Structures are given as structure tokens and as C-alpha cells.
């Protein structure tokens, strides 16, 4: 999970323009400005690089902060 989660963090930092250290548990997608189209692109990048079975809407539907996404990636 650790390597896959770290690659996911790199993808999120790339898309949002933030830095890995900044994407902490408390931060919320609303503050990061992860827009709905942004959620789609992030999900596509995740399922393309790390080859995960993540539906395009779980990020928006379930993940309101980084912690929820971390839990989802924990599998």
C-alpha cells in the first residue's frame, strides 16, 4: 500500500499543483480546489499508472479529505 499510496500522492500533487508534504489528512478537496473534472482526471491517472479499480466517482462521492482517500486506497 505504501508504494502505491505514495505514487498516488505524487499524482495528486501533480494534478493539484501542491507538494507531497502538503496533502495531509486534515486537508479537504474543497480547499485543494479538486474540481469535479479534476476528480475525473485524477481517477483516470490513478487507474492508468497504478492500475487500481477505482470508480470515477468514489473520489468525489466518498473522499471529502485526504484521509478518506487514504483509507479507500488501503483496500
Amino acid at each position: 500500500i505504501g508504494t502505491v499510496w505514495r505514487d498516488a500522492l505524487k499524482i495528486l500533487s501533480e494534478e493539484s499543483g501542491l507538494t507531497d508534504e502538503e496533502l495531509t489528512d486534515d486537508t479537504s478537496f474543497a480547499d485543494v480546489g479538486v474540481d469535479s473534472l479534476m476528480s475525473l482526471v485524477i481517477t483516470s491517472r490513478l487507474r492508468d499508472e497504478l492500475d487500481i479499480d477505482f470508480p470515477d466517482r468514489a473520489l468525489f462521492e466518498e473522499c471529502q479529505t485526504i484521509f478518506d482517500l487514504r483509507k479507500r486506497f488501503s483496500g
Binding site: 494534478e15 473534472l37 479534476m38 475525473l40 482526471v41 483516470s44
Partner: protein
């Protein structure tokens, strides 16, 4: 949203720089093309409804 044939569409997208993020949508045909369809097309598609007055 921008649409075209897949090959030319990919060719056009490649010349979009980094701060111009892009994705792909599950559309499998061209729509909203004033230069592709004409009134004949809309007449054909809707021609299945029999004519009547009620």
C-alpha cells in the same frame, strides 16, 4: 468540450500545454456538428413516429 475523429482528436490534444489539463469522455460518435448533419438527418431520425392529430 472538443470532439473529432479519434486520430485527429489525439493529434490536436497533443499540442495542448501543461496548464490545459484534458481527459476523455465515453462518447462513441460525433454530435452537435452543424457541418456534418442537416435537416434531412433530423427528418430521417424522427420519421419513425406515424403522423396523426391527437
Amino acid at each position: 468540450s472538443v470532439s473529432a475523429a479519434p486520430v485527429i482528436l489525439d493529434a490536436f490534444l497533443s499540442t495542448l500545454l501543461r496548464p490545459l489539463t484534458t481527459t476523455r469522455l465515453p462518447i462513441t460518435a460525433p454530435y452537435h456538428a452543424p457541418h456534418l448533419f442537416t435537416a434531412k438527418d433530423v427528418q430521417h431520425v424522427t420519421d419513425c413516429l406515424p403522423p396523426s392529430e391527437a
